[PDB]
């Protein structure tokens, strides 16, 4: 991937980490029954007023080695191209060729 895309993902991750507590508090207040309807509406507006990158749906899993955005395999954190190379030379513990 281009270096700009990797820096973009890094920036989005940092923003998500920064705004994590306030967003959780806002959603809890929204889902709080005991709070007044006015309070819930104000919390909804506050949650809608956050920066877009604060939301975690805009994060895309990329290969930890090359930044490829397709074929991720969350368990290893590597795209398929690097996963094949690293597995077949013995650097991934416990992974072997499967036959049955």
């Amino acid at each position: 991937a281009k270096k700009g895309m990797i820096n973009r993902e890094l920036k989005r991750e940092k923003t998500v980490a920064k705004y994590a507590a306030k967003r959780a508090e806002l959603k809890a207040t929204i889902a709080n029954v005991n709070a007044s309807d006015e309070e819930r509406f104000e919390a909804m507006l506050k949650l809608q007023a956050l920066p877009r990158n604060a939301s975690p749906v805009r994060l895309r899993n990329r290969c930890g080695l090359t930044g490829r955005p397709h074929g991720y395999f969350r368990k290893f954190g590597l795209s398929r191209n690097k996963l094949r190379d690293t597995v077949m030379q013995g650097d991934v513990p416990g992974v072997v060729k499967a036959s049955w």
């Binding site: 930890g64 954190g77 077949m88 030379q89 013995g90 650097d91 991934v92 060729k97």
Partner: protein, 215 residues
């Protein structure tokens, strides 16, 4: 056609893994990434130390890296100063204290990685590729190997059309899963591009299975 990786196909038969630790699904990815970073840093830092195998282990909240080298003196230092450094940067890269252990290779000519690195370094100095392959094969066969195969691919000798050459002496039974085959790949960067080098060394079959390999 294409050929399977000689170590990958034997990883569960007569070969061990270069990584030996356990992690739950949450920590597995983080551990793997830090291990790969450690391997890359070590490979970059110890080019001239004849380093072949790096084994990473995580016993319990710590790290242990075993480095197999043919020049333990360069890795260790005149008073062991460099091992303290290596531990410092490895503890920085990982998140746990790390111990560095040294494993001397007393037969450098039976190690596939070192032979490939020697051939690549020679090719990077405009040495004739046929001469380099023949010398490497002769030295390995004299060191007591049962067979060796060496292959070079690319713009050999500066030619505009790339081609693949290979030379072999002895036996290399790749289809036998219990054969002890060491395999290595290394690239040499010349002014005309990249030349790939592949080395296979056969050291005899392994009888008794993985149980006798003592997994």
């Amino acid at each position: 056609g294409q050929k399977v990786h000689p170590i990958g196909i034997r990883l569960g038969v007569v070969k061990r893994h270069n990584a030996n630790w356990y992690a739950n699904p949450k920590q597995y990815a983080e551990y793997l990434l830090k291990d790969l970073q450690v391997r890359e840093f070590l490979t970059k830092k110890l080019k001239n130390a004849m380093v072949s195998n790096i084994l990473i282990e995580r016993p319990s909240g710590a790290a242990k890296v075993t480095i197999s080298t043919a020049r333990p003196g360069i890795v260790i230092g005149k008073k062991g100063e460099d091992i303290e450094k290596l531990q410092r940067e490895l503890t920085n890269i990982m998140g746990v204290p790390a111990q560095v252990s040294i494993n001397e290779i007393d037969r450098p000519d039976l190690d596939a990685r070192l032979v490939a690195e020697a051939i690549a370094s020679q090719l990077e100095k405009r040495v004739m590729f046929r001469r380099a392959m023949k010398r490497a094969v002769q030295n390995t066969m004299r060191a007591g190997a049962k067979g060796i195969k060496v292959e070079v691919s690319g713009r050999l000798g500066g030619a505009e059309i790339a081609r693949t050459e290979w030379y072999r002496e002895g036996r290399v039974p790749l289809h036998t899963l219990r054969a002890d085959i060491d395999y290595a790949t290394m690239r040499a960067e010349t002014t005309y591009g990249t030349i790939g080098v592949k080395v296979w060394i056969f050291r005899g079959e392994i009888l008794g299975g993985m149980k006798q390999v003592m997994n």
